[PDB]
Amino acid sequence: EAAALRAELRDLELEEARLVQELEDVDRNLARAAADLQAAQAEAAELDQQERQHYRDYSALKRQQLELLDQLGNVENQLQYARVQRDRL
Amino acid sequence: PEAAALRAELRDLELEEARLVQELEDVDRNLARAAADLQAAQAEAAELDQQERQHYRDYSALKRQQLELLDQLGNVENQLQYARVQRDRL
């Protein structure tokens, strides 16, 4: 009568076998989710790169534009001086 | 008189200023275009961030689930270990 212990062992052993099985399902499900995340992450790095390229292009072009505004400001100065002198006549 | 040299310096300056205006027009077009390219890539990334977080949620949920199931399995293992001792004692 001390082998109800046997039945207890059987029950526990199947409970474990059932968990193991479920764990197998969650594992291959976890693999599929991690691959989808990994892919999106890579896509995100890529986008970061495109963004950087467009921003750096803008910064560069901005540099050009500030210089050109300096040059233009100077020509405007010389235009102002020459037209004052001209009017002096 | 001197006013011939002036009318000429004015012609030259008006010519240079004009040219720079052109250069500036070109630079500003490429600028507005680059900013727009940027805005588009930032919108595309935003959409991508949304998807990325959804996949992260799914992955987290699976992960939580797996630790859940491993815990349970460890609780059953605690039981099986006890019965195995009580059993081996006979």
Swiss-Prot record, chain A:
UniProt keyword Ubl conjugation present: no
This protein's record includes keyword Coiled coil: yes
Coiled coil location: 1-89
Annotated GO MF terms: phosphatidylinositol 3-kinase binding; protein-containing complex binding; protein-macromolecule adaptor activity
Effect of A40L: Decreases interaction with ATG14. Probably strongly increases homodimerization
Tissue: Present in fetal and adult brain (at protein level).
GO BP terms, alphabetized: autophagosome assembly; autophagy; cellular response to nitrogen starvation; endosome to lysosome transport; G protein-coupled receptor catabolic process; glucose homeostasis; late endosome to vacuole transport; mitophagy
Outcome after substituting Q65L: Decreases homodimerization. Decreases interaction with ATG14
Subcellular location: Cytoplasm
Keywords from the UniProt entry: Autophagy, Coiled coil, Cytoplasm
Major site of localization recorded for this protein: cytoplasm
A GO cellular component annotation in the UniProt record: phosphatidylinositol 3-kinase complex, class III, type I
Outcome recorded upon mutating E16L: Decreases homodimerization. Decreases interaction with ATG14
Function recorded in the entry: Involved in 2 distinct lysosomal degradation pathways: acts as a regulator of autophagy and as a regulator of G-protein coupled receptors turnover. Regulates degradation in lysosomes of a variety of G-protein coupled receptors via its interaction with GPRASP1/GASP1.
Subunit structure: Homodimer (via coiled-coil domain). Interacts (via coiled-coil domain) with ATG14 (via coiled-coil domain); this interaction is tighter than BECN2 self-association. Interacts with AMBRA1, UVRAG and PIK3C3/VPS34; these interactions are not disrupted by starvation. Does not interact with RUBCN. Interacts (via N-terminus) with GPRASP1/GASP1; the interaction is direct.
Name of the protein in its database record: Beclin-2
Segment of the intact protein contained: 158 to 246 of 431
